Every structure is written in C-alpha cells, then in structure tokens.
Curated annotation (Swiss-Prot), chain A:
This is Small ribosomal subunit protein uS10m. It is found in: Mitochondrion. Keywords: Mitochondrion, Ribonucleoprotein, Ribosomal protein. GO terms for biological process: mitochondrial translation. The lineage of its organism: Eukaryota, Metazoa, Chordata, Craniata, Vertebrata. The chain holds residues 52 to 189 of 201 of the full protein. Its main location: mitochondrion. Component of the mitochondrial small ribosomal subunit (mt-SSU). Mature mammalian 55S mitochondrial ribosomes consist of a small (28S) and a large (39S) subunit. The 28S small subunit contains a 12S ribosomal RNA (12S mt-rRNA) and 30 different proteins. The 39S large subunit contains a 16S rRNA (16S mt-rRNA), a copy of mitochondrial valine transfer RNA (mt-tRNA(Val)), which plays an integral structural role, and 52 different proteins. Belongs to the universal ribosomal protein uS10 family. GO terms for cellular component: mitochondrial inner membrane; mitochondrial matrix; mitochondrial small ribosomal subunit; mitochondrion.
UniProtKB/Swiss-Prot annotation, chain B:
It is linked to Combined oxidative phosphorylation deficiency 38: An autosomal recessive disorder due to mitochondrial dysfunction and characterized by perinatal hypertrophic cardiomyopathy, growth retardation, muscle hypotonia, elevated lactate, dysmorphy and intellectual disability. One of its GO terms (cellular component) is mitochondrial ribosome. This is Small ribosomal subunit protein uS14m. Component of the mitochondrial small ribosomal subunit (mt-SSU). Mature mammalian 55S mitochondrial ribosomes consist of a small (28S) and a large (39S) subunit. The 28S small subunit contains a 12S ribosomal RNA (12S mt-rRNA) and 30 different proteins. The 39S large subunit contains a 16S rRNA (16S mt-rRNA), a copy of mitochondrial valine transfer RNA (mt-tRNA(Val)), which plays an integral structural role, and 52 different proteins. Interacts with LIAT1. GO terms for biological process: mitochondrial translation; translation. It comes from Homo sapiens (Human). Belongs to the universal ribosomal protein uS14 family. GO terms for molecular function: RNA binding; structural constituent of ribosome.
Curated annotation (Swiss-Prot), chain C:
The gene is MRPS24. GO terms for biological process: mitochondrial translation. This is Small ribosomal subunit protein uS3m. Belongs to the universal ribosomal protein uS3 family. It is found in: Mitochondrion. Keywords: Mitochondrion, Ribonucleoprotein, Ribosomal protein, Transit peptide. It comes from the Eukaryota.
Curated annotation (Swiss-Prot), chain D:
One of its GO terms (biological process) is mitochondrial translation. The chain holds residues 62 to 394 of 396 of the full protein. Belongs to the universal ribosomal protein uS9 family. This is Small ribosomal subunit protein uS9m. Keywords: Acetylation, Mitochondrion, Ribonucleoprotein, Ribosomal protein, Transit peptide. Component of the mitochondrial small ribosomal subunit (mt-SSU). Mature mammalian 55S mitochondrial ribosomes consist of a small (28S) and a large (39S) subunit. The 28S small subunit contains a 12S ribosomal RNA (12S mt-rRNA) and 30 different proteins. The 39S large subunit contains a 16S rRNA (16S mt-rRNA), a copy of mitochondrial valine transfer RNA (mt-tRNA(Val)), which plays an integral structural role, and 52 different proteins. Its main location: mitochondrion. The keyword Kinase does not apply. The modification N6-acetyllysine is found at residue 209. The keyword Transport does not apply. It is found in: Mitochondrion. Residues 296-316 are annotated as: Disordered.
Amino acid sequence: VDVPKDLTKPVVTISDEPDILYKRLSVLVKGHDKAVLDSYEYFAVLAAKELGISIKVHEPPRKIERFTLLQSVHIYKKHRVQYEMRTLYRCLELEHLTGSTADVYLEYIQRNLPEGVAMEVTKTQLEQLPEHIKEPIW
Amino acid sequence: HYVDWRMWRDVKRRKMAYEYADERLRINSLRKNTILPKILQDVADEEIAALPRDSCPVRIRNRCVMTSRPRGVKRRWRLSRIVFRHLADHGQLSGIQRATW
Amino acid sequence: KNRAARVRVSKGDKPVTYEEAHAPHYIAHRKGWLSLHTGNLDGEDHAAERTVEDVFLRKFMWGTFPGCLADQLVLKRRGNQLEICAVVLRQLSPHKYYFLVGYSETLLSYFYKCPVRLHLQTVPSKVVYKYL
Amino acid sequence: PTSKRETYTEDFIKKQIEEFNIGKRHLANMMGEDPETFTQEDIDRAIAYLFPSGLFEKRARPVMKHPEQIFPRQRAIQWGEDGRPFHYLFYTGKQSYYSLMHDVYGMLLNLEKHQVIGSRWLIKEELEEMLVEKLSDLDYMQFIRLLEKLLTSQCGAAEEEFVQRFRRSVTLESKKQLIEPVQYDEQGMAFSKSEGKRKTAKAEAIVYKHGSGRIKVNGIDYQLYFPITQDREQLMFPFHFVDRLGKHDVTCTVSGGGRSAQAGAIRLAMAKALCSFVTEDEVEWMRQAGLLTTDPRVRERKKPGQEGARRKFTWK
RNA sequence: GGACCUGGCGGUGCUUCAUAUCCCUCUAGAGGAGCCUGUUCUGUAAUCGAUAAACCCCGAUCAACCUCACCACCUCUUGCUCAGCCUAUAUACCGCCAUCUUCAGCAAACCCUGAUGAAGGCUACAAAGUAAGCGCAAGUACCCACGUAAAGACGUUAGGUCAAGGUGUAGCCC
Ligand SMILES: [K+]
Ligand SMILES: [K+]
Ligand SMILES: [K+]
Ligand SMILES: [K+]
Ligand SMILES: [K+]
Ligand SMILES: [K+]
Ligand SMILES: [Mg+2]
Ligand SMILES: [Mg+2]
Ligand SMILES: [Mg+2]
Ligand SMILES: [Mg+2]
Ligand SMILES: [Mg+2]
Ligand SMILES: [Mg+2]
Ligand SMILES: [Mg+2]
Ligand SMILES: [Mg+2]
Ligand SMILES: [Mg+2]
Ligand SMILES: [Mg+2]
C-alpha cells in the first residue's frame, strides 16, 4: 500500500550538435574464472537486445603464464614449485551504435563488471573527410 | 622502520637517483655523440663523474619490500620467492595457482 | 615433505576450517581466492601495489577486531571501490562493531584514497569443517 | 569428544524438503519463470548464473538439489521400543546380505525338487546401495557364484526376473567410422570433406569421387610439396590399401607441424573422406589397418628437476 | 645370571620377483683432450653456508661499484627506527624443505587372547577382531579411460637453513 504516487526522472536533454557514429564496438573482458565470463555475457547480451543493439560473441584463445620457484628456503635446487596465472577472454562485438547509446550501455555494463574482470573497449568512429582534403590548394 | 640498513641505503640511493636524473641525462647526451668536439665531451666526462655515487642508477638494487632480500625477487610483485609462495599458498594472490600439465 | 599451508593430523580434537583444511594444490579446484583484482591478469599492471594493500588490510583488521574474526578476509575490488567482507563472532557488543566499522572505513578511505566499505557477517561460533 | 558423525534423522530431512520447495518457488520469481514447470535443470542453470564458480571440481560448486540426492542413505533404526529387532538375522551384522543369500539358496533347492552381450553383473559399489550394507570383496564374489549357478540350472520365469535385477546394462559404442555426407559442387562433382590431426599439424582434405589421381597440397603438387619419398608413401597408403589408385582427385590444405606431421594429418583426412566412396566392409579394414585412428602421441613436457621429459640429470 | 618379547642385522633359507632395474642384454654418453663452471687443498690483509646416498652451475631465475655480510684505513654516538647487531647456539624453535616415498601404511576409541607379563590379533567350505579419521585410492589439471604432472600420512636421519624473515636463551652497547 505504501508506494510513490509520482516519480522524478533524470533529465536527458537533446543537444543541437550531431552525434558520434561507431561502426563497431568491441568489448574484451579478461578473467581467471570462465563461469563469471559466461554469466557476464548473458547480462551484456540480454541488455543489448533490450536496447536494440546488434551483438556477436566469440571466445579468443586463453593465455597461461607460468613460472617456477625454489621449493626450499635454502639449497635443494632440484626441487621447485610451479605457479600459473590463467587469463580467459570474451569479446562482445557490437555494431552500428551511436555515441549516446554506447555511453549508457558501457556505463551500465562497466559499473556491473565483477571483481577480477578487466575490460578493453575499442571504439571505431566514423568521420568525414576534412574540408582541406576535398580539393588541392592550387 | 625499514627491514634493515641495506634496505635503507637503497632508499637513499633511489632518492638521490631521482634528483639527478635530468642533470645526468643532459650531460650524457653530449658524451653520447660524434658531433660535439672532444674538448667539450672531455669536460662532460669530468662533470658527470663528480656527482655523488648514489645518483648512479647502477647502484640501485631491487630488493624485496618485506624482507629486503636481494636475490630471488619477482619484479612484478616485488617479493621474494619465499614471501610470494606464502601468500600464494594461502590463496591471497588473485589468479595465482599451482601449475599442473 | 611438503609443509606449506597444511594442518598436520592430530588425535581428532583440532577443529579446522574449509580454507584451513585444504592445501595449496586445491586453491583453484576446491578453493577460490581471498582477493580478487585485475592486477595479475595478462596485460594488467599495479599488481605489486594491490598486494601491499592486502597484506596491510588483513593485519589492520586482525588488530582492530581482536578475537572477533572467525575466518580470513575476502577483499573485493570494483573500480575505485574496495569491499572488505568478514565473518565475525557475536561475543562483542553491536555498539562496538558500528564504531569499528565507521573508524576503519573512514581511516582506510583517507589512507588509500578510495571508497572503502566493510560488510560484517556475524556467526555464533567458528564454523568447523572437520576435526583433524 | 568434539567430532561426532553428522547423523540426519527423518524429522530433520522432512524440514529440508519444505525449504527446497519454498526455495524452488523463490528462484523462479527471480528468473521470471513459472514455478510449476520449473525443473531441476533450470535450477542448475540459475544457480550457475547467480553464483558463478570456476572451480574445476564440480562437487565443490554451489548446488541446490533435493535433500534425497544430497544427504546419504542411512541405516534406519533396527528395533522397536521393546528392543526386539524386526529382522530375524539382525545379529549377523549383514542382515540384508544374508537374507539375499538365504533367498537365493532357497530357490536352488526347489529347482532340484521339481526337476549375454550388453549386460554385466552389478558391481560391488552398486550392490552396497541396494542393501545399505558395507560388503567385502570376497562376500560379493560368493553372491555372484550363486547367481551364475542359478542361471546354469533350468530356472523358471520368476527366477529370471530376480537375476535381472542384479544385471546392470553397458552401452557399447559400435566401433564404426562415421561416414561423411557426400556433397556436390557448382559443377556437380561429388566429394567428401574431412579433417585430420597429427602432433601439431591439422589438415582438411577434399576427396572427389572421380579423378585422375591428382593431389594438391596448399595449391602445390604433392611431389613438389613433399620431396621426401616417405611422405609420398604415406599419401599413397590409404588408396593402395583400397586398391583404387588413380581414381580420385584430392585438394588438401595442411597447416602447422613439420614435414612428417603434415603427411600423417593428410593421410588421416583423406582416409576418412575416402570412406564415403567405399563399402562398409572396406571401411572396417581401414580401421583395422590404423588408417582412421588419430595418433595420440604428442611431445611430453619437461620437468623442473630433470634434463628432459624423462631424462634425469647425471647422478653424482 | 637364567628364560622370553620386540626391533634391527645376517658373507641367513625357501619361493616368487625386479622393466630402465639388481646382473647380463639394447642406445647415447662419463672417465681420455681443450675450454666453461663448482668444490677441495694451497695462497692472500681479505666472507658465510651446503658438503656419503640426500653436497658439488647447490642458496645465486646469478658478485666490475652497488649487491657485501669480508679486509685495511678514517669517522660518528639516543644512532633510519619509543634504538641497533649477517653476534653464538638449526643440539631451543616456527617457517619452508630433503630423504626413505619409484613406499603402504597410520591411527583414535572399544573388544578379545595370553592365568589380566612385555606383547599379540589371520584361514572365505573362515578359527577374534571391529573401526571414524590421515594417507594411498578416487576425483581434478594438461590433448580422453592412457600417460605425465600434482599429491604423497605417521615416522626416520637431534638431516638442511638463526645469513629469507621472525624468534627463545646467553652475549655486545664510544
Ligand atoms: K629378529
Ligand atoms: K667421452
Ligand atoms: K673430458
Ligand atoms: K626444521
Ligand atoms: K636467533
Ligand atoms: K633467520
Ligand atoms: Mg618433492
Ligand atoms: Mg662509451
Ligand atoms: Mg634430449
Ligand atoms: Mg666456497
Ligand atoms: Mg665498495
Ligand atoms: Mg657486520
Ligand atoms: Mg635440523
Ligand atoms: Mg589419470
Ligand atoms: Mg612428483
Ligand atoms: Mg591422488
């Protein structure tokens, strides 16, 4: 029975300047756990379909960095211990976005990025030839 | 409150190497060329050799930050193999696990 | 023989925890990690500075909540934020817990220039996995 | 004493049955599903999204199963308030095992009075679940000896049902090569495509149904690509065995590995793609000749304390 | 001193074995030469430690200065530190390991035997043993079911290291 009668919505004004067009948006997420990346893909792909964005998913080959260390504090060289770090990837290649659309979507997924998961967003912007490049200055 | 005096000496070394970094760079630039006269390069060879020994970066030693161990140090974590394993064997280093293949 | 992070067998009167009952070769098979950040990922940096913060935070909480820590800390990092998650005993009064939460959160936020939040989970007694 | 075996009574398990049913309706409200048609496969899918764990051990990950599949079966109370055991063989210690030997030995006496592939005997570990009694190896063998003795005799219809209970089933995968689907190109030529693997070499081979025995590896004639005769011999082997040399046109593309690793990978690909243009009997001969099996021999890793994979440093 | 028990040993017996293993048998090597490198002796004013198997390109995935602890000379004194010490003791220790382990034992709590001695405890057509727990095993990792890693209890050698760090005890403090 106790519910807000009216709600206030954040102001989103429409500017006069043009918007930035992104031909492709590539999101690469790293992690040590594959289940957190499979669970993050579901949220990112479902958020895109609800926003109307084309998205493709593939999984780049993982990398395993290894290194060895002496087992004992002193002597006993032949006995060592090996450690590794596993990095698993997941690329989400969105297409045909705009600056505003990418801005909110990236903020939404970036904020909810789980602990132990990095991100590399590569943005391919569409531009037009500069005025000077149109004709030579004879 | 550093581990030992050996660590304390390096701390000073690293502090004096940061103050003379630019001065030494500008003087070496003259020496590292075949353009300027030898007369000027010979004067720069005496100027960079008169600076304090602790400004030289070849005296800096990458010791451990917890036990000041000079050898057996991992540069990415600045820890000795003994301190690295201790934290890695207890699951305190994100991503670090034992390798089996 | 190997000794690291192993609790030697006893008559049976020694209670050990899940994390304390598993050795290093189970850290990614039966155990997780107590700290989770990106420093150790391929192509990431500042792995030596996130590590020093963890060593100090575990000692700051052990000496700031004396006798109250049932198990090890679970440090979580999300961007600027740092989340400390702890299991604590119910012996201490709640009034004193709230004091230590506002003192540790604030002190550690001005020391590591980051928003620090601490999430306590009280337990009656130290959860026992088995008796070695 | 601090260590006590966790014993679960019927009342405790009865309260766990109610918490799972209520938790099953909560998990369906989170995911937006219908509680009624919410199976256990969806619970496993929802718990893997909400609680993502990458632990290699699947028994150490979060699990929300029915209490009858988690808690183990426990020997129930074996006596009433008075204290008399229900069963007449309680004092034996193995009342379930000895009641079965008493029943089997009683059916073998009646027989005297009036007078297979795909199946295996119940294993020891599976026989302790039907009886909820720990059994030694020797006792299991004794039980199997009576069942076999039962089969040799002219057992009645009822006895066959009794023995069948202890006979588990094994699904045997027929050792038959999987034929590739013959395709047709724009011109209409029939062919079959397959893939091979040898060490680090991977190969894809296209085998045309009708050809003049021309092979092109990576767009190069095989004799040019493979100068060493041995490599050419490997290519011939599949076709020579099925006595059809100079009848197909092959176009393959091998990548990775070395000289001898690439041929082996092509041999296996051609052989697999040549099984679609031969009879079933010929494909079994190829299998028995080792032409359709992937050699699993790969380089062995070096160990930290040794000179090599298995070689050890000199002992002083 | 007599008679037993356990354990170890035996140039002790029988039988069965060793799959890279004891020997023969297959293949490439060592010891021979030169160089590199470590150690031991010697030497020097001029470190330490490991040092049969289980030391010897071992701590060091590393010494021109630094590292550095060594030697010689000079200098300072509440001294980077609510001091300090690479001073002695690894035969006070934690910690991390070696080794047998290329093992299969280990064991609480009960019970029984031996007249209630130390001790001991199986026979499946079964004769006093039952056993949680630790290990093996199983699971897991890597390219599977294979194999390789990893794992590998309790103990042994007062094994190794106070010079990773910490630390008990004794000692130094112009
Ligand atoms: K004896
Ligand atoms: K030789
Ligand atoms: K020689
Ligand atoms: K020791
Ligand atoms: K000491
Ligand atoms: K020490
Ligand atoms: Mg070992
Ligand atoms: Mg020069
Ligand atoms: Mg070799
Ligand atoms: Mg020496
Ligand atoms: Mg000097
Ligand atoms: Mg000294
Ligand atoms: Mg010792
Ligand atoms: Mg295996
Ligand atoms: Mg091993
Ligand atoms: Mg195992």
